[PDB]
């Protein structure tokens, strides 16, 4: 309590002395000479000294007169049922200046590992209302499904549409949406806020906002916070949660930043090296547990470098995350909204989520025949790539009407259009 033995300040780090009972990854708060107060977290503890990182920074600290207090608990998020309708910062602190929230209980944000046998497989699909997602790589409750896109491809716009139109057919209780904004600009953040207010989803949603201005170490916590709140709603309160996290790329950038700040030797391709485990720890907090009502679904939005050479490796996560959804600007150029390249997108859990009793079962057969129509329809128009002098010009025009029609209509249904699955099926029938 209120130790006053700061012996070093280097960069954003500090060294404290004559402290005992200090655990690793333990939150501290610093009392400066000017009465300012800052939060930091223990990152290394020796026999008597300990070493911490300050979130806000070390500018303005006088070591002789500053003081440190060890809280005695790691990073926590207070959980309450009153979260809905609310906006929080990176560390789950109110950002809308609303009523004070009394936490039901304070939860460690790292979470726990579901026992493999305990986990329950996902068998029921979720109607996105997007023909280019529902029919084919369909999304099931509890699935880990990510959308890959480049900046300015409308990836954020698609994410908004999914949030607005997400629902399930049983609908005994309504859906719940947890949205995390990770290291994104104000303009980007504002887009989502405006959509939710306008559409009224704020009353039905909970969100955590972390902008680029905010410190990198708050980005790490931001995902953990959103998933911990999602788990609280999902399992303790039985809700059905859709978790949407926007640009885990910058979470990964922050991961590298923190690793360099902690003087950790880089891993593969200059990244920390525990990225595989860190991402998998995040992404695997999904699915349904047997014996519990609620469920957790994740649609992480990820900015994708055009090159495969560097950033948060698509296949580093892609095989972690049970399928993926691809957006491309080449697509986007010709009024194709939401630009979903359907060639390389898959939902790993599509087969089981698709059947009579959960879907109208034209759908599995019709999806497979339209999957053949994807391949053959591509053959018909997509594969030409300005070639096909003779190919598709020999009364394959059925083909050479199919796929261009499909690419325009089906992929660009309009960002504010909601297609009931049966309809999507029907427009597939029309295209048949």
């Amino acid at each position: 309590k209120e130790y006053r033995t700061i012996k070093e300040v280097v960069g954003p780090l500090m060294a404290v002395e004559k402290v005992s009972g200090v655990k690793y990854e333990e939150l501290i708060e610093v009392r400066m000479q000017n009465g300012e107060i800052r939060r930091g977290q223990v990152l290394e503890v020796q026999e008597d000294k300990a070493m911490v990182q300050i979130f806000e920074g070390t500018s303005g600290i006088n070591l002789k007169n500053s003081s440190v207090r060890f809280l005695g608990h790691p990073l926590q998020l207070g959980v309450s049922e009153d979260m809905i309708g609310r906006v929080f910062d990176g560390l789950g602190r109110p950002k809308d200046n609303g009523p004070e929230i009394l936490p039901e209980k304070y939860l460690d944000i790292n979470g726990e590992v579901i026992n493999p046998i305990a986990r329950d497989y996902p068998d029921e699909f979720i109607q996105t209302g997007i023909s280019a997602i529902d029919h084919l790589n369909t999304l099931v409750r509890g699935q880990k499904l990510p959308v890959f896109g480049p900046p300015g491809a409308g990836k954020s716009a698609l994410a908004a549409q999914i949030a607005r139109q997400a629902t399930v057919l049983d609908s005994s209780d309504d859906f719940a949406v947890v949205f995390a904004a990770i290291g994104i600009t104000f303009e980007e953040a504002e887009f989502f806020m405006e959509d939710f207010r306008q559409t009224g989803a704020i009353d039905r949603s909970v969100m955590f906002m972390n902008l680029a201005n905010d410190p990198a170490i708050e980005r790490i916590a931001t995902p953990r916070m959103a998933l911990t709140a999602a788990e609280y709603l999902a399992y303790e309160k039985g809700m059905h949660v859709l978790v949407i996290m926007e640009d885990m790329t910058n979470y990964a950038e922050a991961l590298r930043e923190i690793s360099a700040a902690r003087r950790e030797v880089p891993g593969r391709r200059g990244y920390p090296g525990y990225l595989y485990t860190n991402l998998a720890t995040l992404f695997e907090r999904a699915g349904r547990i047997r014996g519990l009502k609620g469920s957790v679904t994740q649609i992480p939005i990820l900015t994708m470098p055009e090159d495969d050479k560097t950033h948060p490796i698509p296949d580093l996560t892609g095989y972690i995350t049970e399928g993926q959804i691809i957006l491309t600007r080449e697509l986007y150029k010709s009024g194709i909204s939401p630009p979903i390249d359907v060639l390389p997108s898959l939902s790993r859990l599509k087969d089981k989520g698709t059947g009579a009793g959960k879907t109208r079962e034209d759908h599995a057969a019709t999806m497979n025949q339209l999957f053949a129509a994807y391949a053959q329809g591509k053959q018909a128009k997509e594969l030409a790539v300005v070639l096909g002098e003779s190919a598709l010009s020999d009364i394959d025009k059925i083909y050479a009407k199919f796929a261009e029609r499909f690419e325009n209509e089906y992929v660009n249904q309009g960002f504010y259009t909601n297609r009931t699955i049966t309809e999507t099926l029907d427009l597939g029938w029309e295209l048949l």
Partner: protein, 586 residues
């Protein structure tokens, strides 16, 4: 024992003092919680321990204690029909004890049930000189499998007292007079996970394994003790293939290892394996199966250790004289556990971020699988056959994992998604796949069958190769263009692919094909090809042959559905072929 004290905590690294009696690679319980950890360094009496679980909330001054052993497994009754993780934690018991769907942190549970009562049956008589590996008695663990208690290694001497009866694992069942004195023997022995079990001598695997699946047994067989690597592209039906191999192969026990999977991908395996049915007994496969399963976000060391734990158990049941088959899925995930674990240990990266000892590690694993003479007076033979699923991790063959695996294995079953799109199951590409056991298996096959099986297999493969080249020719020209000889070879190739190569795993009779039945089927196809080629040299035109043979060809297609009692109907096809074809030429 000695209780150490934590002097440093940095990430996953914990350093404890007063730990001189501990050794390198020993397992320790770290902190008040006692999370699992492993010693990697030692300077004077202080040790650098690597913690597998999360180290948050752990600090200095907390006690540390050492198990006095490296990573190890408990081997005895109660081990079958169990769901384990990489470090042999009982998942099933894990739930009931702690009443939680979560894998607790620093939660310690014994692997086996140390307080169930088994009827030990003493098969040995007192005063007998015993060595490491002799069988003193047995316990009927499940309805299928007989669990035999054998002398643990490092024990030599003379039996003093031994009596049958209802015992737990922990209470002693027999006393042995040794040079050091008397050693009591429990029913369970422990073994370090990464130290391979000893054998009298290793010897070649030359006896093929009946997997039932036609393409495997016929063209790319695997020897009892061989190593088969199979890639797992999405939707290729690999799951079905694994199940088929597991329940149909003539092995006594099956060990399935899930190194690090997607969770939902894991739960499918968990639900579908108990529902598999052992054919010869009608019971669940779990009565003779051991399943180890780790999802992706689990402690990394459990994922790396998964393979070694599985093969250690397979080596346990191997020393009993049993034939064991161990399935690993996915080995690619395991290598990922290695790359991350190597990074955590500040190692020097090699190929594409993988450590430099990747090929060495994989070689160590695959060389333990094989056919051996187990220790003991009896000189019994046991074997381990390894099926490893390498996730492509991006469609390529140049992956360090796949190349290094293929450097020490002889069987390759290349699953192709293209064939799955064409409803060709099992979707094994016959051209890309290979087996280096084909020669030895052909010799063994020719002898026991007393036929020229090798000639038949080589002829079928030759026809398939020619089929590839012919239909590539066809794309450029047209199907009419080639000769009746070449076009006939095309249709015989179609016959091989459809009747003999394709197999429906769910059909009652199509799923399993007796070895004699495999022979009769292939002979039917090949006698057809010969008689029609002959009739072409006899001047009959292709189309006339086609009509008279349409009638009998339908019999060939439905012949792959014929029961194993009624094999006389298959040989009869030969007769019908000869009289029909010779009749068509008038």
């Amino acid at each position: 024992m000695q209780i150490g004290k934590i002097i440093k905590v940095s990430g996953p690294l914990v350093m404890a003092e007063n730990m001189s009696e501990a050794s390198i690679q020993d397992m320790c319980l770290v902190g008040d919680l006692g999370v699992i950890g492993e010693i990697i360094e030692m300077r004077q009496d202080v040790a650098s321990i690597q913690v597998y679980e999360e180290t948050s909330g752990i600090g200095p001054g907390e006690p540390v204690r050492s198990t006095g052993e490296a990573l190890s497994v408990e081997l005895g009754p109660g081990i079958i029909s169990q769901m384990f993780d990489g470090i042999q934690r009982p998942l099933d018991t894990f739930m009931e004890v702690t009443q939680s769907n979560f894998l607790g942190r620093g939660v310690q549970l014994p692997a086996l049930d140390h307080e169930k009562q088994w009827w030990f049956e003493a098969t040995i008589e007192e005063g007998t000189e015993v060595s490491a590996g002799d069988i003193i008695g047995y316990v009927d663990e499940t309805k299928i499998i007989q669990h035999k208690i054998m002398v643990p290694n490092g024990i030599k001497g003379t039996v003093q007292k031994i009596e049958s009866g209802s015992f737990t694992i922990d209470d002693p069942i027999c006393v042995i007079e040794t040079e050091q004195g008397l050693k009591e023997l429990t029913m369970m022995q422990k073994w370090p996970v990464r130290r391979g079990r000893p054998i009298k001598q290793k010897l070649n695997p030359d006896v093929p394994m009946i997997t039932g699946q036609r393409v495997i047994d016929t063209f790319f067989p695997v020897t009892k003790g061989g190593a088969a690597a199979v890639p797992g592209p999405f939707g290729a039906g690999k799951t079905v293939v694994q199940h088929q191999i597991a329940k149909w192969s003539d092995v006594d026990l099956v060990v399935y290892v899930g190194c690090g999977e997607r969770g939902n991908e894991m739960t499918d395996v968990v639900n579908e394996f108990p529902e598999l049915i052992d054919p010869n007994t009608g019971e669940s496969l779990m009565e003779r199966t051991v399943l180890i399963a780790n999802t992706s976000n689990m402690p990394v060391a459990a994922r790396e250790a998964s393979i070694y734990t599985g093969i250690t158990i397979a080596e346990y049941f191997r020393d009993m004289g049993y034939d064991v088959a161990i399935m690993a899925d996915s080995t690619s995930r395991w290598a990922e556990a290695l790359r991350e674990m190597s990074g955590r240990l500040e190692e020097m990266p090699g190929d594409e971020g993988y450590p430099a000892y990747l090929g060495s590690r994989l070689a160590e694993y695959y060389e333990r699988s094989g056919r051996v003479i187990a220790l003991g007076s009896d000189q019994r033979e046991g074997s381990i056959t390894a099926i490893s699923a390498v996730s492509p991790s991006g469609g390529d063959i140049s992956e360090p994992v796949t190349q290094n695996t293929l450097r020490v294995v002889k069987v390759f079953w290349g699953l192709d998604s293209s064939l799955a799109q064409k409803r060709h199951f099992p979707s094994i590409n016959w051209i890309q796949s290979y087996s280096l056991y084909s020669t030895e298996v052909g010799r063994y096959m020719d002898q026991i069958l007393q036929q020229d099986w090798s000639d038949m297999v080589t002829e079928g493969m030759r026809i398939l190769q020619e089929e590839e080249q012919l239909n590539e020719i066809v794309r450029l020209v047209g199907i009419d263009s080639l000769s009746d000889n070449d076009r006939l070879t095309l249709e015989v190739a179609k016959s091989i692919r459809e009747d003999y190569l394709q197999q429906n795993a769910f059909d009652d009779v199509d799923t399993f094909t007796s070895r004699e039945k495999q022979f009769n089927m292939l002979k039917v196809i090949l006698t057809f090809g010969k008689e029609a080629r002959k009739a072409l040299s006899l001047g009959a035109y292709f189309n006339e042959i086609m009509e008279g043979t349409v009638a009998v060809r339908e019999r060939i297609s439905r012949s792959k559905y014929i029961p194993e009692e009624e094999l006389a109907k298959i040989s009869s096809i030969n007769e019908e072929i000869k009289e029909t074809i010779q009749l068509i030429v008038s």
